[PDB]
Amino acid sequence: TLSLQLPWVEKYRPQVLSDIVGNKETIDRLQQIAKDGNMPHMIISGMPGIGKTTSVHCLAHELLGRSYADGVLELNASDDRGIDVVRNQIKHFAQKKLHLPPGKHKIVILDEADSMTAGAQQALRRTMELYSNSTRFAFACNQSNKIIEPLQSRCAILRYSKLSDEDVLKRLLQIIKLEDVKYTNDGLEAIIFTAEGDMRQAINNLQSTVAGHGLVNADNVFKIVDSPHPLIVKKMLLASNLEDSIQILRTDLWKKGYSSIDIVTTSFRVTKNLAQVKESVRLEMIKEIGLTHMRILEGVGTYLQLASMLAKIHKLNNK
Amino acid sequence: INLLSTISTTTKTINHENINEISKAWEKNIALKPFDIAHKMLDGQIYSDIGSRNFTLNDKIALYFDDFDFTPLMIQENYLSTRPSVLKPGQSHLEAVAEAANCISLGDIVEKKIRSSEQLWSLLPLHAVLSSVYPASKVAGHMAGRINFTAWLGQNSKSAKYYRLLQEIHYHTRLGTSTDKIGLRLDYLPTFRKRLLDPFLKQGADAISSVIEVMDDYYLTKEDWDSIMEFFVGPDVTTAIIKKIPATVKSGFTRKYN
Amino acid sequence: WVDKYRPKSLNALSHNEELTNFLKSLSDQPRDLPHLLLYGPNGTGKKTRCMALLESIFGPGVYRLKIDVRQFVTASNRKLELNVVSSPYHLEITPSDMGNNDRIVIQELLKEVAQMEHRYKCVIINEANSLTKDAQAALRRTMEKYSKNIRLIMVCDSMSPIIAPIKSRCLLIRCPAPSDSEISTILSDVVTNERIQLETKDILKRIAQASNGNLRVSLLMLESMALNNELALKSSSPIIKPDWIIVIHKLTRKIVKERSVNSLIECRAVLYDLLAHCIPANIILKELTFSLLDVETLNTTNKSSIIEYSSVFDERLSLGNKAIFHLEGFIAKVMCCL
Amino acid sequence: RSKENLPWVEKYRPETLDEVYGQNEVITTVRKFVDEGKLPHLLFYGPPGTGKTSTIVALAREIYGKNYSNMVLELNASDDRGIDVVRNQIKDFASTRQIFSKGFKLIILDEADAMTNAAQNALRRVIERYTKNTRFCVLANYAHKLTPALLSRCTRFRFQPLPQEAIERRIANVLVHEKLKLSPNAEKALIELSNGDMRRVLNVLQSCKATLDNPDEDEISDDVIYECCGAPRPSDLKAVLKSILEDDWGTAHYTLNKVRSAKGLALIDLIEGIVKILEDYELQNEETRVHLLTKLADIEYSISKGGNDQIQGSAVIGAIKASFENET
Amino acid sequence: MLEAKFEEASLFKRIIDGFKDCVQLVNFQCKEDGIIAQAVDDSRVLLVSLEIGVEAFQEYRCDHPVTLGMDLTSLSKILRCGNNTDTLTLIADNTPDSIILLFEDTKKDRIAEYSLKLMDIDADFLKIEELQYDSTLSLPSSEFSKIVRDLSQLSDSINIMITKETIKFVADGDIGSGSVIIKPFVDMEHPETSIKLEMDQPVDLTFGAKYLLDIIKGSSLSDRVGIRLSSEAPALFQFDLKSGFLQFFLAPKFN
Amino acid sequence: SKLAAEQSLAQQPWVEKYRPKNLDEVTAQDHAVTVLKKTLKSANLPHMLFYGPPGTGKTSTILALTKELYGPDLMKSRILELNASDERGISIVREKVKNFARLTVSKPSKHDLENYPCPPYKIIILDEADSMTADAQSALRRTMETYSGVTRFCLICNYVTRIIDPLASRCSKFRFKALDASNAIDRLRFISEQENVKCDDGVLERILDISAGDLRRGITLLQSASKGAQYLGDGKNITSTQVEELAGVVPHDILIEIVEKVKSGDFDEIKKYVNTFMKSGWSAASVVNQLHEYYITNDNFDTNFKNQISWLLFTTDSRLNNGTNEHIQLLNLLVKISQL
DNA sequence: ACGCGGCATTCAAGGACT
DNA sequence: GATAAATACAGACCTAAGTCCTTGAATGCCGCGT
DNA sequence: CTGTATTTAT
Ligand SMILES: Nc1ncnc2c1ncn2[C@@H]1O[C@H](COP(=O)(O)OP(=O)(O)OP(O)(O)=S)[C@@H](O)[C@H]1O
Ligand SMILES: Nc1ncnc2c1ncn2[C@@H]1O[C@H](COP(=O)(O)OP(=O)(O)OP(O)(O)=S)[C@@H](O)[C@H]1O
Ligand SMILES: Nc1ncnc2c1ncn2[C@@H]1O[C@H](COP(=O)(O)OP(=O)(O)O)[C@@H](O)[C@H]1O
Ligand SMILES: Nc1ncnc2c1ncn2[C@@H]1O[C@H](COP(=O)(O)OP(=O)(O)O)[C@@H](O)[C@H]1O
Ligand SMILES: [Mg+2]
Ligand SMILES: [Mg+2]
Ligand SMILES: [Mg+2]
């Protein structure tokens, strides 16, 4: 078909701050700031798909009213991460004179701010303070650690958290009711489980299920969206017997098409994040997994090395 | 001040009831300096059963990742200067030190693999574990003395300087001697001392001519002589020997060579 | 001196007559000569035999060596300089002086001399073990493509670092170390020519047995003890051991006596002191292990564990840039064994 | 050329969405997506030779027609993975219209797992901003290399390794296109050695056709397949394993040496086959499996680093014998 | 064999310089009617369609159809090796490989023989669609290039609006905005300076500054440029030569 | 011209003198040369992966195939050779290789088509493709695929594991078998007869046995033995013991001495005998090979002893192939066998 | 024709890589 | 004014490696004015 | 940790 329909993530992107479901304290604080005015400098950080860009965009829209065209400067940090940007474009926008409602000021939105280079970030330090009376900067990034500490000092540290299953279920139910989709409770629960708090993943998976099969049922959602790799990897690592681990590997990972490097990397990540196993045993399994990773990266990527790694882990656990 | 401004928009009374949530959301995550990483990584409470839940393994890996160029060196330099407190029943301090050193050897292998022509940077968490966390967990406890800085850097620079000097000396004497760079230091240098420095020790200022003949036989200079006199170790150190040589002898040697 | 008396021709060689006959057999028809790789114990006389073969193939002017400087550029803008000893009929490359950039020196200089051209020029790679695997991989095709213009002769001590294709492409010439009797005969000739008074001749055999087959070390030790006894060797003349030997021996005594971490302080201190003064770590491990084996107090189990851990940490050293990181581990493991 | 002078791997590349087999779920899901028009951002991650590139090229043909090479920005991410690409080419293509016909824009990124992290961080906003008139497809063999942000904005489809039936149908189509015949046992051996990759199947089929003296009338038997591929026959594998298990060391060494020398089989393939056979076994104790797997893994790694073939074979014999000696 | 001779060696120089920056890969296919060249930019935003005719060549001979592919970066380098007072000769053998360029001047006996290795460019679609565009206008090339280069400094997007006898170029950026208003006027004294505009329906679309600046590099070929616009159709930027034309097909942005 | 090259080759090392000029001269790697010969008639050469032990004939086979395809004169224009001596980074893959592949096939001359097939493509030969990084091979992944119409790719590597999986998947895998005595004996006999080399009954078989799957080493050994025999002037035949002496082969008596010293479990005596042994240049790998042969072949040792000694020798070989010190590993192995 | 004047392009140094 | 609490804070910074990225300096060609 | 520096307290 020549034309396409808009995705549900962008078509149903919240246009007001109330539609945002998660992080109730932060959303209420941003709504109070929007009503009262005098927006402070901030960095918004968290996981992908929990509503950081949407929150800042709704805040800017509501704060600036009809003046969003001029008062808002949109600059994807990854696209424009040079000191030249700060020297010319950001500085000229900050020195720009614009008549606004009393409380409100001009807003700079720098999405994906974690990718800004050191030079541009350091140059922004004085632009943040010199033109603060007229210009207010806003930062959105996946990881706040990439942003230098002095820049974090000048702004409010507003930190987001992974979306709870209840809020994702509420948003999914709202979209389902609005667009008349047939669903089952098991299917919605499975979509929430696969999303793992990423609302964007949940909505994309709902779109895929609806378009492909037409009914939101557990069977369809599992065929169209596979079970999360770390869970099968953890089940393989935490099996009681060696033969069980070998069987889980052969069936779920090797025969299904997962690569050796992916398997070993996910095993390392799961092992480092495991909590039931004591730290010493966890560390020695990490050692064995790292040896297997070294062999795979040197070029020996085979079922034999993965089985040997499982055998070493089981020997380590069996004392 | 920014926290006070931002919080006060919604909550008008900051009290002891919400101080915990305010602190947990506004805490500064500042990268620890390579000394605080050494202190915290070499701590018994961190690797304890209770401490493991509070400070998880991923936190330890991130603590490494704060400084990925100095933590392996700091742990290697200060893993055997701590009083252990996590020793297994039937394990002494020396056994834990040996296991930790084995782990640092594996971590050095991993680092060489990462920092070579292959550039296997995906093994960086494995290096974090092998270099910092496992060796420190083996010898975790209380700091006996002070946390010293890595001595490997200065000794490596000294080794590079001495290798440059040995290269110059070997290439000067290449025509005379059919040797390699290492073999010269291994074998000839002790005899070169006996043919250069000992005559000044026994014959006196009259052995200057023979010494000059020896240097001219292999195209050596005063700088070459000084560099060879700085190459010996242990019993054969010449730092005090050259001082005890009369200043007249050294001055006459310099003037005669010039 | 060692350099004072060195054979300058094949017919002047006096030890391992089989090797001399093999070299003359190769020199009989020199237009058909494979690439060579001289290997054997260090100090045998492999370089002398290679240069004698060169003199046999070419004229007697191969010994007129001249040092030249050939600046090279690495992948980065850094400038690197090499001293290339050269002769009218041959040139010598010792890539151990450079670090990981020996590959560049190989591929540029050898290809250049190939384009430059008794139709072949022999290149002597004195240090072949320090050649990185990448450098040998680059040299793998240089030997075969330019076999009509350049014929490499390689000097080596242990063939294990050298990769299989390089050994395959080149003829292997074994060099047995001189026997004690031949070393004693050479020392007798030297002392006769150098006018060194000998009280008896058992001194020469003692020096030969204290060199472990090395002739360079034998002559150096001869002259070293000739200076401490006023050019007159006596029966009770002490055997001159180099400084690093004494330091390593004291290290073994300390490891045998004090098996503590507090002793590990000074053990690491001595290892650092040795490493900072132009001493390789593999040599340190070899001498330390063999001196530890010579300790009479230790029983067979300790000796076996020591040699096992020595092999393990030798592998670790061979696969590791930071040498003390493995040396300290070996010493600590030996202390735990004891 | 006429597409007749090309290797069978490229000659038999699918041209329409109906010639891609095995990935039926993905094929029907994508066909229904394009038919109804809600085509989301696609992520085809799977093992090599599963048809991901063929699937997306057939998608381009079915979406835009025969003129699909000019209305689609197909970028080899391995060849050009810089952030300059995202800033200039990808962004200008997404922003602008089509020079040929009205319609949406599709950008296919092949081997995006080699893209630098800066490039993906730049793309994670280009994809979102221009979603109204541009769609992105990401193909990557490895999903760990790709940034997590790039895995949140693209719908994920997993390309399973090609099953038996799809490989049989493609083999039949290739056999019909050429003048060739395949024995059922030879086809079974080819399927087993394929490991789910059609690339290997086509390469081995072409090599066996070349091997055939007069391909017009003769048949490719299992012997031809094994000889041209070089893989060991199952009979040789069983004989070697039986000789190692319950025979004397001298006889076992003789059997392994004669099996290797007679057919030219490599030792590493013998180890893989022996691992496959002994995995199917039912073992009394756990320790024997652990020892067998560990020792065989180190032997295979040392073979990957090279060395002495006879020593490695004797090591295999000793490891197997000790492991089954633990079962007493 | 192909033996195409230019009386003005600088003509092919100017044509190649017109679209050297726009594209690097172009298929110069030579037939009996003349040389036809077509190429697409890496971003696939501009279509270049060159059509040289036999009248341009002093002597043109093409035995059989031939497709000559080359790199514009290297070919332009080859062309800068000729003086103004020379005659170019394009030579290609029966099998297309290693095109030969000959720069000859007979007043002072000099010969310049240069070669360029051909490349296998698979894309040979060779399609342009004649459409009844909503508006067809013609203005001097220098004025259009001046307007484009003056408005490209304000922003990266230039908006062109066609209304009843009014042509407007609008560029709104971060430092400000600007709009140039011109009307179709006919001057009898100097016909070259006149501006024509035949409009059917109002036209409103936006283009990119980089591609527009790349297009105006072709102003060195002809003194007047014709621009044809239509609703959601490729804007046709046409430079008419003595024997043929050079057309830039731009794709507008999305509203 | 041809006479000068013929004389030059007539006096060069025998490793290069008898380099196979044609595909027929390949001695034992039939399973690949038959495919290339049947592709000679056609023009559908697949992407090829040549992986095998060193000295098996991959380079010779791929140098004869392109010759038979294109002709001596045409081959230079149609062939790009890039070894490990040239840079193997991403840039050399994205610029040199891409430009060469993108270039149109060069025009064959009238002499070329009449005699030689001259297929309408060109082969890029990448010697030692294992040394290349995974990034360069990833870049080549689509470079070979897109331009397969006019360009063909051949990769030669000692170890197939170094090559990334998709690259090996695209290229056809041709395993060059080891060149043992049985398969290369005819070639070695031909070379010996061509130079009038005189040997006993078992010299050639023993030469190939010591070579252990490498024809290059056997050729070099035969050349050295012939040179020694010619220098001797005795006029007799080369004897197997002479070859073993010239091949770095430990004498049997010394091997029995080491075995006897291992039998008596005294650490000091074993250490002394190894110290005396390393005073001769017997390579450690050549000692481990003979120890393995003697211990495994002999039937006087128990099965468990064989199982343990095989793993010990495997570990020693693995450690020795990493660049360790021969003396320490040899002593460790001998001590472990003594305790066995 | 002949000389500056910005502006595009090429070169070189520093930092980072989970 | 000296000596304790009570605590914040400094101890130090290397050389290679491959490839992408950015920033400033040095470089080139091309348009306008006289 | 050890050693040095600064501010409030005795
Ligand atoms: N499902 C399939 N049906 C038919 N032929 C297939 C299929 N999968 C692979 N092939 C064949 O294998 C060739 C390679 O397919 P590709 O799609 O290029 O491989 P791939 O799945 O993209 O894996 P890469 O290239 O390593 S990422 C095709 O040209 C076909 O000839
Ligand atoms: N199959 C063979 N038939 C005849 N001679 C051979 C054969 N294989 C090797 N040779 C001889 O050995 C020489 C070298 O062969 P190569 O093909 O270079 O070996 P190789 O496979 O390249 O080993 P590498 O380069 O170390 S992987 C040839 O010139 C021949 O003299
Ligand atoms: N808390 C939320 N409530 C409602 N929708 C959400 C929420 N979080 C994410 N979304 C949906 O996800 C889509 C994109 O999320 P976005 O805000 O871009 O993620 P990120 O915060 O990582 O930038 C939006 O269209 C929005 O509909
Ligand atoms: N056949 C020989 N006869 C006499 N002296 C010899 C002989 N071979 C070696 N030498 C002595 O060895 C010295 C050089 O040893 P060298 O060749 O550097 O050892 P390496 O084998 O480690 O290169 C010379 O000074 C020479 O006197
Ligand atoms: Mg966002
Ligand atoms: Mg693909
Ligand atoms: Mg080769």
The ranges assigned to domains in chain A are 1-163, 164-227, 228-319
For C329, half-sphere exposure in the C-beta direction (CA atoms, 13 angstrom radius) is: 29
Q: Which atom of ligand 2 is nearest to the CA of F60?
A: 17
> Tokens in use for D265?
């089989």
Domains and CATH numbers, chain C: 10-174 (3.40.50.300), 180-233 (1.10.8.60), 243-337 (1.20.272.10)
- The total of structural domains in chain F comes to 3
Which residue type does A103 have? G
User: Measured from the CB, is residue C44 less than 6 Å from ligand 4?
Assistant: yes
Q: What CA–CA distance (Å, rounded) separates A161 from A147?
A: 18
Between the CA of F179 and the centroid of ligand 2 the distance, in Å, is 10
Note whether F221 and F171 are same-domain residues: no
Q: What CA–CA distance (Å, rounded) separates A93 from A72?
A: 9
Ligand positioned closest to the Cα atom of F51:
2
C205 is in an annotated binding site: no
Note whether F45 and F61 are same-domain residues: yes
Burial class for D2, CB neighbours closer than 10 Å (0-12, 13-18, 19+): exposed
D141 is in an annotated binding site: yes
Note whether F3 and F124 are same-domain residues: yes
A297 CB less than 7 Å from any atom of strand G = no
Residue (of B129, B127, B58, B51) closest to A273 by Cα position = B58
Residue (of C126, C155, C185, C180) closest to C5 by Cα position = C185
Residues in a beta bridge with F110: none
Crossing angle of helices A279-298/D286-304, nearest 10°? 40
Residue (of B78, B71, B73, B82) closest to B45 by Cα position = B82
H/E element holding F27? none
Residue of F nearest to E121 (CA): F102
> Tokens in use for A276?
């039931």
> Tokens in use for E16?
């190649």
Residue (of D61, D56, D79) closest to D71 by Cα position = D61
H/E element holding D11? helix D8-11
Sign of CA dihedral F329, F331, F337, F340: negative
User: Which 64-83 positions of C have CB less than 7 A from strand G?
Assistant: 77
Helices (H) and strands (E) in chain A, counts: 17, 5
Neighbours of C77 (CB within 10 A): 6
CB burial string A266-291: b at 16+ within 10 A, e below = bbbbbbbebeeeebbebbbbbbbbbb
Question: With an 8 Å Cβ cutoff, are F332 and C310 in contact?
Answer: yes
Structure obtained using: cryo-EM
B195 CB less than 7 Å from any atom of strand I = no
Alpha helices in C110-179 (DSSP H): 111-116, 133-145, 164-169
How far: F221 CA to H19 C1' (Å)?
44
Provide the CA C323 distance to its chain's centre, in angstroms. Answer: 19
SS3 per residue for C284-307: HHHHHHHHHHCCCCCCHHHHHHHH
User: Which positions ≥6 away from A88 have C-beta within 8 Å?
Assistant: none
DSSP secondary structure letters along F134-160: HHHHHHHHHHHHHTTTTEEEEEEES-T
Residue D37's region, left for phi above 0, alpha for psi from -120 to 50, else beta, is: left
B29 CB less than 7 Å from any atom of strand G = no
Provide the CA C304 distance to its chain's centre, in angstroms. Answer: 28
Residue (of F172, F116, F118) closest to D209 by Cα position = F172
Helices (H) and strands (E) in chain C, counts: 14, 9
User: Which positions ≥6 away from E116 have C-beta within 8 Å?
Assistant: E70, E71, E74, E75, E78, E98, E99, E101
Q: What CA–CA distance (Å, rounded) separates D319 from D275?
A: 12
Q: What CA–CA distance (Å, rounded) separates A51 from A45?
A: 10
Q: What CA–CA distance (Å, rounded) separates C106 from C109?
A: 6
Helix (H, G, I), strand (E, B) or coil at C143: helix
Question: With an 8 Å Cβ cutoff, are A4 and D39 in contact?
Answer: yes
Yes or no: say if D294 and A312 are a contact pair by the CB < 8 Å rule. yes
Q: Which of A266, A272, A277, A295 to mutate to test the interface with B (most CBs of B within 10 A)?
A: A272
Q: What are phi and psi of A26, to 5 degrees?
A: -65, -40
Q: List the end-to-end C-alpha distance of chain B, in Å, as a whole number.
A: 73
CB burial string A179-206: b at 16+ within 10 A, e below = eebebeeebbebbbbbbbbbbbbbbbbb
> Tokens in use for C76?
């980065």
- Domains of chain D, residue spans: 1-162, 163-231, 232-328
Yes or no: say if A73 and A109 are a contact pair by the CB < 8 Å rule. yes
Residue (of F331, B109, A290, B181) closest to C323 by Cα position = B109
Select from C18, C215, C217 the residue to mutate for testing ligand 4; criterion: most ligand atoms less than 8 Å from CB. C215
User: Which positions ≥6 away from D140 have C-beta within 8 Å?
Assistant: D43, D45, D111, D112, D113, D146
Nucleotide at minimal C1' distance from the B126 CA: G18
User: Measured from the CB, is residue F64 less than 6 Å from ligand 2?
Assistant: no
Indicate the resolution in Å.
3.0
Q: What is the CA radius of gyration of chain D?
A: 25
User: How many CB pairs (< 8 A) connect A and B?
Assistant: 81
Q: What are phi and psi of D148, to 5 degrees?
A: -60, -30
Helix (H, G, I), strand (E, B) or coil at C250: helix
Distance between F42 CA and the closest CA of chain C, angstroms: 30
User: Which positions ≥6 away from B79 have C-beta within 8 Å?
Assistant: B42, B97, B100, B104, B135, B136, B139
Ligand positioned closest to the Cα atom of D56:
1
Domain boundary among F204, F224, F249: F249
For A108, half-sphere exposure in the C-beta direction (CA atoms, 13 angstrom radius) is: 28
User: Measured from the CB, is residue D232 less than 6 Å from ligand 1?
Assistant: no
Q: What CA–CA distance (Å, rounded) separates F265 from F268?
A: 9
Note whether F175 and F202 are same-domain residues: no
Nearest to B190 among C51, C224, C326 (CB): C224
Residue (of E157, E161, E181, E159) closest to E170 by Cα position = E159
Sign of CA dihedral D259, D265, D271, D272: negative
Look at the block and give the residue holding tokens 């992908």: A48
Yes or no: say if D14 and A183 are a contact pair by the CB < 8 Å rule. no
Q: What CA–CA distance (Å, rounded) separates F236 from F200?
A: 9
Note whether F298 and F226 are same-domain residues: no
A and C touching (3 or more beta-carbon pairs closer than 8 Å): no
Helix (H, G, I), strand (E, B) or coil at F238: strand
Helix (H, G, I), strand (E, B) or coil at A197: coil
Domain boundary among F194, F219, F249: F249
Residues in a beta bridge with A184: none
Residues in a beta bridge with E101: E90, E114
Chain F touched by E124 (CB under 8 Å): no
Yes or no: say if C172 and C22 are a contact pair by the CB < 8 Å rule. no
Sign of CA dihedral A267, A272, A273, A276: positive
Q: What CA–CA distance (Å, rounded) separates F176 from F58?
A: 7
Note whether F47 and F175 are same-domain residues: yes
Residue (of B159, B187, B160, B161) closest to B173 by Cα position = B187
E and B touching (3 or more beta-carbon pairs closer than 8 Å): no
Crossing angle of helices B93-114/C324-337, nearest 10°? 150
User: Which positions ≥6 away from F92 have C-beta within 8 Å?
Assistant: F82, F86, F136
Neighbours of E146 (CB within 10 A): 14
H/E element holding C124? strand C121-125
Query: What is each CA distance from C325 to B104, B105, B157, C320, F324, in whole angstroms?
Result: 7, 6, 16, 8, 17
Q: What CA–CA distance (Å, rounded) separates A131 from A127?
A: 6
Q: What DSSP designation does C241 have?
A: -
SS3 per residue for chain E: CEEEEECCHHHHHHHHHHHCCCCCEEEEEECCCCEEEEEECCCCCEEEEEECCCCCEEECCECCCEEEEEEHHHHHHHHCCCCCCCEEEEEECCCCCCEEEEEEECCCCEEEEEEECCECCCCCCCCCCCCCCCEEEEEEHHHHHHHHHHHCCCCCEEEEEEECCEEEEEEECCCCEEEEEECCCCCCCCHHHCCEEEECCCEEEEEEHHHHHHHHHHHHCCCEEEEEECCCCCEEEEEECCCCEEEEEECCECC
Note whether F219 and F318 are same-domain residues: no
> Tokens in use for A181?
């989709």
Note whether F269 and F134 are same-domain residues: no
- Domain region containing F201: 180-249
H/E element holding A147? none
SS3 per residue for C26-50: HHHCCCCCCCEEEECCCCCCHHHHH
Yes or no: say if B232 and B189 are a contact pair by the CB < 8 Å rule. yes
For F43, half-sphere exposure in the C-beta direction (CA atoms, 13 angstrom radius) is: 18
> What does the longest C-alpha to C-alpha distance in chain A come to?
74
Nucleotide at minimal C1' distance from the B148 CA: H11
Between the CA of C52 and the centroid of ligand 1 the distance, in Å, is 61
Residue (of E126, E120, E145, E122) closest to E47 by Cα position = E126
How far: A208 CA to H20 C1' (Å)?
36
> Tokens in use for F216?
């290059």
Reading across the β-sheet that carries E177-182, which strands appear in turn? E177-182, E166-172, E157-163, E203-208
Residue (of F292, F326, F331, F327) closest to F310 by Cα position = F292
Alpha carbon nearest to ligand 3 atom 5, residue: A20
Residue (of A78, A154, A152) closest to A110 by Cα position = A78
